[PDB]
C-alpha cells in the first residue's frame, strides 16, 4: 500500500539538564498508493448515491417503486458503512472516508425525504 | 536525449534495474538505479543532479534523462536487471540479463 518517496537522515546532541546526549534519526515519508480505495471503497457508495437519483425520474404515482427504491439504497449505504468497519484497520478516529461515507448517507436520505414531500403534497392532501 | 530499457519477461522476479556505462579500453561503471516502486532511486556521485532516471508501468519502465553531455560520457551505456535478494548495486557482477550497450558520443 505504500510506497518510500523521500528518507532523511539526520544528525544531533540532544540537551538535557544530566548534559548533551548524541543522538541520529532515519525518517521514511510513506505515501499510501490510492485504487484499493478509490476504486473500492469509494466507488460503490458513489454508484449507490447515484443510484438513489433515479426516483426522482420515475413517475410520482409509483409509490411502491420509489419508496422501495430509496429505502433499499439507505439499507445498502448502511450495509456498506458498517460492513467497511471491520474492512479499514480498526483504529477509532475521525477519518475521510467516514466524512465520504457520511456525505453519500446524507444524500440518499434526503432524496427519501424529497419522495416524502412530492407523495404529500402532489398526490395525498 | 532520453535512453530508454524495455524488459520482457517475469520482470516481476528482478524488480531493481539500472544503467552501467562504458568507454574503450575501459570497464563497466555504474550509472545509476531504480526499484520496483518507482518512489526511489539511486545515482553515483559523478552522474549527481546531471542525470535522472524514472520508472513507468507496462513494459518499458525504465527512463534515463541525460543533460549536461560531456566529452567523457562519450561511452556505451548498459542496461541491467538484478534479483530482489542480492547485493549491492554499485557492482556489475551482481546483475545477470544484461542488455544491448547503446552507443552515445558527445
Known amino acids: 500500500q505504500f510506497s518510500i518517496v523521500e528518507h532523511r537522515l539526520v544528525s544531533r546532541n540532544v540537551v538535557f539538564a544530566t548534559g548533551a546526549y548524541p543522538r541520529l534519526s532515519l525518517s521514511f515519508r510513506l505515501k499510501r498508493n490510492i485504487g484499493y480505495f478509490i476504486l473500492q471503497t469509494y466507488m460503490p457508495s458513489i454508484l449507490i448515491t447515484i443510484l438513489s437519483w433515479v426516483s426522482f425520474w420515475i413517475n410520482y404515482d409509483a409509490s411502491a417503486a420509489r419508496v422501495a427504491l430509496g429505502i433499499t439504497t439507505v439499507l445498502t449505504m448502511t450495509t456498506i458503512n458498517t460492513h467497511l468497519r471491520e474492512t479499514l484497520p480498526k483504529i477509532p478516529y475521525v477519518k475521510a472516508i467516514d466524512m465520504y461515507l457520511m456525505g453519500c448517507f446524507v444524500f440518499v436520505f434526503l432524496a427519501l425525504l424529497e419522495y416524502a414531500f412530492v407523495n404529500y403534497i402532489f398526490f395525498g392532501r | 536525449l532520453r535512453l530508454s530499457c524495455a524488459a520482457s519477461?517475469?520482470?516481476?522476479?528482478?524488480?531493481?534495474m539500472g544503467w552501467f556505462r562504458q568507454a574503450p579500453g575501459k570497464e563497466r561503471e555504474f550509472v545509476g538505479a531504480i526499484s520496483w516502486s518507482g518512489g526511489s532511486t539511486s545515482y553515483a556521485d559523478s552522474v549527481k543532479d546531471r542525470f535522472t532516471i524514472s520508472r513507468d508501468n507496462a513494459k518499458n519502465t525504465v527512463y534515463l534523462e541525460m543533460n549536461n553531455l560531456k566529452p567523457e560520457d562519450t561511452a556505451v551505456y548498459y542496461c541491467?536487471?538484478?534479483?530482489?535478494?542480492?547485493?549491492?548495486?554499485?557492482?556489475?557482477?551482481?546483475?545477470?540479463?544484461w542488455g544491448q550497450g547503446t552507443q552515445v558520443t558527445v
Open positions: 541491467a536487471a538484478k534479483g530482489r535478494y542480492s547485493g549491492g548495486l554499485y557492482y556489475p557482477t551482481n546483475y545477470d540479463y
Open positions: 519477461g517475469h520482470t516481476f522476479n528482478y524488480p531493481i
